[PDB]
Design an enzyme around this catalytic site. Structure first.
Site, PDB file in Angstrom:
ATOM      1  N   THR A  10      13.722   2.717   6.824  1.00 46.86           N
ATOM      2  CA  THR A  10      13.848   2.329   8.220  1.00 46.86           C
ATOM      3  C   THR A  10      14.828   1.178   8.397  1.00 46.86           C
ATOM      4  O   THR A  10      15.829   1.311   9.108  1.00 46.86           O
ATOM      5  CB  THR A  10      12.478   1.941   8.785  1.00 46.86           C
ATOM      6  OG1 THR A  10      11.586   3.059   8.690  1.00 46.86           O
ATOM      7  CG2 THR A  10      12.600   1.515  10.244  1.00 46.86           C
TER       8      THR A  10
ATOM      9  N   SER B  23       2.032  -3.323   5.406  1.00 46.56           N
ATOM     10  CA  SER B  23       3.348  -2.768   5.128  1.00 46.56           C
ATOM     11  C   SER B  23       4.172  -3.813   4.386  1.00 46.56           C
ATOM     12  O   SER B  23       4.539  -4.845   4.956  1.00 46.56           O
ATOM     13  CB  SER B  23       4.044  -2.342   6.421  1.00 46.56           C
ATOM     14  OG  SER B  23       4.596  -3.458   7.097  1.00 46.56           O
TER      15      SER B  23
ATOM     16  N   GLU C 288     -17.707  -1.259  -8.702  1.00 42.88           N
ATOM     17  CA  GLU C 288     -17.633  -0.450  -9.914  1.00 42.88           C
ATOM     18  C   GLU C 288     -16.319   0.316 -10.022  1.00 42.88           C
ATOM     19  O   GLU C 288     -16.148   1.131 -10.932  1.00 42.88           O
ATOM     20  CB  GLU C 288     -18.818   0.507  -9.980  1.00 42.88           C
ATOM     21  CG  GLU C 288     -20.166  -0.172  -9.824  1.00 42.88           C
ATOM     22  CD  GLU C 288     -21.322   0.808  -9.876  1.00 42.88           C
ATOM     23  OE1 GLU C 288     -21.081   1.997 -10.171  1.00 42.88           O
ATOM     24  OE2 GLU C 288     -22.471   0.388  -9.624  1.00 42.88           O
TER      25      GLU C 288
END
Ligand SMILES: Nc1nc2c(ncn2[C@@H]2O[C@H](COP(=O)(O)OP(=O)(O)OP(=O)(O)O)[C@@H](O)[C@H]2O)c(=O)[nH]1
Ligand SMILES: Nc1nc2c(ncn2[C@@H]2O[C@H](COP(=O)(O)OP(=O)(O)OP(=O)(O)O)[C@@H](O)[C@H]2O)c(=O)[nH]1
Ligand SMILES: Nc1nc2c(ncn2[C@@H]2O[C@H](COP(=O)(O)OP(=O)(O)OP(=O)(O)O)[C@@H](O)[C@H]2O)c(=O)[nH]1
Ligand SMILES: Nc1nc2c(ncn2[C@@H]2O[C@H](COP(=O)(O)OP(=O)(O)O)[C@@H](O)[C@H]2O)c(=O)[nH]1
Ligand SMILES: [Mg+2]
Ligand SMILES: [Mg+2]
Ligand SMILES: [Mg+2]
Lengths: 430, 431, 136, 49, 431
Positions: free
Chosen positions: B171, B132, B246
């Site tokens: 928040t 986060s 890849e």
């Protein structure tokens, strides 16, 4: 005698490799476990070409499976006919290439490529008298395009008088598979034109038109796909292994298909192919094979082959048919379509006849034409490839593995010249 | 000889950390107890030679409350006892605390553990990082975790699923500050990262699952769903494979531009999933629906750079190949000039496992896409405006000076965004 | 352990005459026997010692045998039910378990310490190129 | 030819047992698992007592 | 046909021998009563013809309490009734008291018992003397004892386990004096003695065993395991066996330097023991980990002269050289120039036997390491200085001078320290 050693490179070829050995396996009648149960006396006359001998009378294909990733290799055995492959020839890496050429041609491929370098000499040497080499690879993948090209490069360096062939799958712009397809594919051919003796071009898109137009199968799949070439690959070597009216060795075909040193991109196709519902209906005779052989849709490349002309092309008629009929219709075609055929090389198609047909059909033909159409394929590959480079898009990667912009620069030039040197004969007149 | 080792830093990761395992665990015949009741679990779990299968994960968090949930939860027996390193004082959303004072004395422990994990798995492909950004801890420790790794071993490929703040929902009140500073650390150390804005899911939550009162517990599950798709080809069989090594080789036009936003489909609950045939052609288009984007954007405001979308289930090459055929022509999806072909296609046969106690209604087909388009600049340019608003009067700047950071750190970071912001404009101009 | 292995040299020496003197076939038949005789040469070792679509396997875990474990902590009443644990609270049923499996197996990959590089000395022989008969 | 049948089998027959020998370890690795499975169960509770 | 005699004194001998004998009895199946419930046992027990089996040990001590505990404990029936030579008055940490004053009235009894015990045996290889050094409890008796044994027997090898005082944690307050004199006695009379300072275990115990409140009973158990590992090669079948006499010919580079330091691993609790494979590959590295050193000394600060580390269990012999090769490459790890190879590798099969109610958790594989590293000077250096600090003004010296000690003894003892330090410095330099 006059045998070959099959070398596969890349995941794509492996899938083709399995069915070709799978498809080829049936023709002679070699059961999956390695125990012969053939019926005909003829079925074993020239078994030496694709089968060795060891303790127990078993047979093992002379193939070397080379890939930088294990995933395809693991699955390749578990299927049918996979136990034919000898465990001691497999070579595989532990890092992978990630569709990036440089990692697979200068950094990782070379180090591990010695092993594939070691084995190949072994397989070729054993046979009585080598006939040549054939190599299949997918230019659209970074790994094979570098390692596969390098192995071809060394082989020419090691055995000058043999002949090398290539079945090539070139990305078609309509159907895309790799964001880096324009980059690698155009680059790789630069070395390909220089050393490879023969390169067969087959487009994925064409593979799909045959299924949804003539074969009329509802849900095509790679197994349906990969099968098509395998039979096609079956025809190319069909005359070499059995008797025939006019035996046509691998070079025999080469003798009549390469007008000049730098024009070595032929394109082939297989037939006939009739819808399962209708198969009970079409007329099976020598002539009918011609409609589907010169047909636009039956020939397996993206470029329409009618936009140019034929420099040289011949078909290897296989099966029992009157030899006068095969010739007469051949000159029959070359008469009333002269516009599409050049004029300073007369009677520009060859003939070949073999007496044993595949199981399930009476008469069929395999065609290999050097048609001027191939000019389109590079242009679109060139057109996109040229466009991407000006912005130096995705250039940091290849610059990060010892490569430079200079190597990128030169290769682009060779394609432009190569394309130019091919279309010249289109307008050439005597 | 192919695996993935997971690193999670921050409370959001831990909660998301649980979500992923429940989806993973049930797809490979593993009960909660970790005791088995051919070799397909090698990528994720390392065989002990006799007995239990061990999760190859490391959990880092500077606060004990969330960790206290795990070690007495239903998955108590699963994770190794001595790999859940924990701290004693929470950073309190202060990015500085996680980068100059408290993180220093706990960074080593994480460094010590990591080398052991690479000691067992043979061919480590890369490191997956879930963090986060908008948190003092997750941004902090997660940031430093990338700094040593980029130098600890070398050219290993890494992936990161960040969580940037929502446009109008947030928040904390300090997210604009620390998030921007976070960008600088993540711009020059990771090959790939995916936008994971929270707001979109709710909007995706509202129509599809037909639940008007979603909770983060519902939120977490879907993200774990994407994890299955991106790494699905590692441990299964399919008609055409794709690998982590890849991905960052084919979804990054230039080294700097490495932000691609994901979109997942379909989302149709079992309450109504049985009135549409779930045809492949319809699903393929459904992914590109502008509004449905998993992210905070309307790609109608920009071009596209590279779309590497992976299918899974009972997909067929025709069902896909034709589907991509229709997409290219449309007027509402425009490609940049210098990439005439702009897709990478995969195939994986496994039907998409459905978690019990969830909402997703099992279907025979699915698609998850990871495409990096120029439209990403909206969040960066948009997030800049909030950062400009506050720093002008130096509000809240007083404490970050209290955790030992020099003032100059703030000034340098902003310049990076503009250069990043400017670059996006440059590459977008047609030649 | 086959008695047919200990046959030593000096034993191939004269062992009478396998065919009798009274049942010798005339030249005509012998010209016709070549086809049968040759085949035995090619397949005799062959007759004795010589002798498709993807399919899914059953999922390893049986639905009836979940054996759900109880939590370590002792929760008393539903009031304190915390969402952070409501994961895995439900045991799998018949519907949840996937119908088909497609495993990837590397038992043939987890071997081969390395590829072989034979550092030998030629030892291949040259057979000459045309009409083997002039080759030494 | 009638002679070569036996020895060519000689490898075949001599090699089946090794396949059984590969089974020898197959029985083998039960030792630790049976060792870890039950005997440790008690020891885990031994600290509990 | 091969025998060894055990000698113990006071703190060290008594309370290490207790545990070592429970370990031996548990391994061989000799119950506390001595009766065997229905040939390897020979190397540590002698036949009583019918029923029991008496261990070949002689317990010696001056203070009756500890010994008296043995005669009335659950192992009362085990030891020979008249081999527990017990004193009457304690030495009270006084080296002089236990070496010139009261030790004389017990050496005569101690030796004769040794004579009779040796009489029965026929394959005497060596003596295992587990004596206390810093404990004035027994040092005085210990120093004299070895002296007499030397001239009495001769070429027979001797092994001793001295527990020196920790650099910082110490029990007695007069320890620095007592140890220095004792070192002088052992100097020319012992062949192999191992550093086992108590400090490491206290660090080792809380690091691995997972008992935040370790105690002496915890401490003793570990030492017992080491002895079993050292000796099992002698009393059980082995592919590449090593006997007691094949140590001093392989770890003592010169007649002077005859000290080595050990370490053991793995150590792990059953609560978390088996979340890993415990692969033989990883165990080898840990044994050389400085953080697990059996003694408070850092091998990083010194070179290596020779390491003869023993395996036990089902270790595949091939892996043995597979693991060792990696050790050499790694890099204040290095071996002195004049040591091309300092490794003695031997493999024994039988898995260690784990006593119920203990802390150690059994496993299929184990290793005990015995390597002599130049870092040994550190313990001598620190103790060498400490003696200087107190002796600067004759602290406590009057008590020693009052028991018959000549005031000139201390100076000659001090000269011993410098000689060893100088020899170590000279041998640690390259050519
Ligand atoms: N009349 C007739 N001529 C034949 C027949 N078969 C081959 N030929 C002649 O052979 C010529 C072509 O050469 P081939 O017989 O195929 O063999 P070749 O001359 O050795 O050429 P290659 O072996 O292919 O290098 C034709 O022009 C024919 O004249 C046949 O059955 N009847
Ligand atoms: N979608 C989603 N996001 C979450 C959830 N839990 C936490 N987050 C994210 O985490 C942020 C809250 O602060 P965190 O970063 O988690 O706090 P932390 O992880 O303990 O790190 P510090 O704040 O520095 O202590 C929110 O803005 C979310 O973006 C969740 O359950 N679902
Ligand atoms: N490991 C261990 N240490 C002990 C034991 N008994 C006492 N000790 C302590 O270990 C320290 C050093 O050990 P020793 O070499 O035995 O010294 P010592 O003979 O005990 O000298 P005293 O303290 O007078 O008894 C002493 O100071 C004691 O405090 C024991 O049984 N085992
Ligand atoms: N003929 C054929 N080509 C395929 C098939 N699957 C993929 N391809 C092509 O092969 C290319 C990728 O090659 P790949 O298998 O990755 O080879 P690699 O780079 O060595 O791994 C793609 O661009 C596809 O167009 C198949 O089943 N048959
Ligand atoms: Mg001819
Ligand atoms: Mg927090
Ligand atoms: Mg004492």
């Amino acid at each position: 005698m006059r045998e070959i050693v099959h070398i596969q490179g890349g995941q794509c070829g492996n899938q083709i490799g399995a069915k070709f050995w799978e498809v080829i396996s049936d023709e002679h009648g070699i059961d999956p476990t390695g125990t012969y149960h053939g019926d005909s006396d003829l079925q074993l006359e020239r078994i030496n070409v694709y089968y060795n001998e060891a303790t127990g009378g078993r047979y093992v294909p002379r193939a070397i499976l080379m890939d930088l990733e294990p995933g395809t290799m693991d699955s390749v055995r578990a299927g049918p006919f996979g136990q034919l492959f000898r465990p001691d020839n497999f070579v595989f890496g532990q890092t992978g290439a990630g569709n990036n050429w440089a990692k697979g041609h200068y950094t990782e491929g070379a180090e591990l490529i010695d092993s594939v370098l070691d084995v190949v000499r072994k397989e070729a040497e054993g046979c009585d008298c080598l006939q040549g080499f054939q190599i299949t690879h997918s230019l659209g993948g970074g790994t094979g395009s570098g390692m596969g090209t390098l192995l071809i490069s060394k082989v020419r360096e090691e055995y000058p008088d043999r002949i090398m062939e290539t079945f090539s799958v070139v990305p078609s712009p309509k159907v895309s598979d790799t964001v880096v397809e324009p980059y690698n594919a155009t680059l790789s051919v630069h070395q390909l034109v220089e050393n490879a003796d023969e390169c067969m071009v087959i487009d994925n898109e064409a593979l799909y038109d045959i299924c949804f137009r003539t074969l009329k199968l509802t849900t095509p799949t790679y197994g349906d796909l990969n099968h098509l070439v395998s039979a096609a690959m079956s025809g190319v070597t069909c005359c070499l292994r059995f008797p025939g009216q006019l035996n046509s060795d691998l070079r025999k075909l080469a003798v009549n298909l390469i007008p000049f040193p730098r024009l070595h991109f032929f394109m082939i196709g297989f037939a006939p192919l009739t819808s399962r519902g209708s198969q009970q209906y079409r007329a099976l005779t020598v002539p009918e094979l011609t409609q589907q052989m010169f047909d636009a849709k039956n020939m397996m490349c993206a470029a329409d082959p009618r936009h140019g002309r034929y420099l040289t092309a011949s078909a290897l008629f296989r099966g029992r048919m009157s030899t006068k009929e095969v010739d007469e219709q051949m000159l029959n075609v070359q008469n009333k379509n002269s516009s599409y055929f050049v004029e300073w090389i007369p009677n520009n198609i060859k003939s070949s006849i073999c007496d044993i047909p595949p199981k399930g059909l009476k008469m069929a033909v395999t065609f290999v034409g050097n048609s001027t159409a191939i000019q389109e394929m590079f242009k679109r590959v060139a057109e996109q490839f040229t466009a991407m480079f000006r912005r130096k898009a995705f250039l940091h990667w290849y610059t990060g593995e010892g490569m430079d912009e200079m190597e990128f620069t030169e290769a682009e030039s060779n394609m432009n010249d190569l394309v130019s040197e091919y279309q010249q004969y289109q307008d050439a007149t005597a | 000889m192919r695996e993935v080792i997971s690193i999670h830093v921050g409370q959001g990761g831990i909660q998301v950390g649980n979500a992923c395992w429940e989806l993973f665990c049930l797809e490979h015949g593993i009960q909660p107890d970790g005791q088995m009741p051919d070799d397909a679990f090698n990528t994720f779990f390392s065989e002990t030679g006799a007995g239990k299968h061990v999760p190859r994960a490391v959990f880092l968090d500077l606060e004990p409350t969330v960790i206290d949930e795990v070690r007495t939860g239903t998955y108590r027996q699963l994770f190794h006892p001595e790999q859940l390193i924990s701290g004693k004082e929470d950073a309190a959303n202060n990015f500085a605390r996680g980068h100059y004072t408290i993180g220093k004395e706990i960074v080593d422990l994480c460094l010590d553990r990591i080398r052991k994990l690479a000691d067992n798995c043979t061919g480590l492909q890369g490191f997956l990082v879930f963090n986060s950004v908008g948190g003092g801890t997750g941004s902090g420790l997660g940031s430093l975790l990338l700094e040593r790794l980029s130098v600890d071993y070398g050219k290993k490929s890494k992936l990161g699923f960040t969580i940037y703040p929502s446009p109008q929902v947030s928040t904390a009140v300090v997210e604009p500050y620390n998030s921007i500073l976070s960008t600088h650390s993540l711009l020059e150390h990771t090959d790939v990262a995916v936008m994971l804005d929270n707001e979109a899911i709710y909007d995706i939550c509202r129509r599809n699952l037909d639940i008007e009162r979603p909770t983060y517990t519902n939120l977490n599950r879907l993200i774990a769903q994407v994890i299955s798709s991106l790494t699905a080809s590692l441990r299964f069989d399919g008609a055409l494979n794709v690998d982590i090594t890849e991905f960052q080789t084919n979804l990054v036009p230039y080294p700097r531009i490495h932000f691609m936003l994901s979109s997942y489909a379909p989302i149709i609950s079992a309450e109504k999933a049985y009135h549409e045939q779930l045809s492949v052609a319809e699903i393929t288009n459904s992914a590109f629906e502008p509004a449905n984007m998993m992210a905070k954007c309307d790609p109608r405001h920009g071009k596209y750079m590279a779309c590497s979308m992976m299918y899974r289930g009972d997909v067929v090459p025709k069902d896909v190949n034709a589907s991509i055929a229709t997409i290219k022509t449309k007027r509402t999806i425009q490609f940049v000039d210098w990439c005439p072909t702009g897709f990478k296609v995969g195939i994986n046969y496994q039907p998409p496992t459905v978690v019990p106690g969830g909402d997703l209604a099992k279907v025979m087909r699915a698609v998850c896409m990871i495409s990096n388009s120029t439209a990403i600049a909206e969040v960066f340019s948009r997030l800049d405006h909030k950062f400009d608003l506050m720093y002008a009067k130096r509000a809240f700047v007083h404490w970050y000076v209290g955790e030992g950071m020099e003032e100059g750190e703030f000034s340098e970071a902003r310049e990076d965004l503009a250069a990043l912001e400017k670059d996006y404009e440059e590459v977008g101009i047609e030649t | 352990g086959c008695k047919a292995m200990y046959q030593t040299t000096n034993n191939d020496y004269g062992q009478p005459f396998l065919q009798d003197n009274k049942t010798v076939p005339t030249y005509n038949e012998l010209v016709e026997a070549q086809t049968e005789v040759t085949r035995a040469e090619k397949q005799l070792k062959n007759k004795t010692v010589a002798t498709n679509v993807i399919v899914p396997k059953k999922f390893p875990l049986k639905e009836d045998s979940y054996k759900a474990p109880e939590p370590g902590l002792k929760i008393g009443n539903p009031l304190y039910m915390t969402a952070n644990r409501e994961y895995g609270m439900l045991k799998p049923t018949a519907f949840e378990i996937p119908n088909r499996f497609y495993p990837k197996d590397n038992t043939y990959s987890k071997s081969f310490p390395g590829m072989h590089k034979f550092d030998g000395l030629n030892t291949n022989i040259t057979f000459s190129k045309v009409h083997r008969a002039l080759d030494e | 030819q009638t002679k070569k049948v036996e020895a060519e089998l000689e490898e075949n027959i001599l090699r089946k047992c090794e396949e059984e020998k590969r089974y020898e370890a197959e029985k083998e690795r039960i030792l630790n698992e049976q060792r870890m499975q039950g005997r440790f169960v008690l020891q885990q509770q031994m600290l509990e007592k």
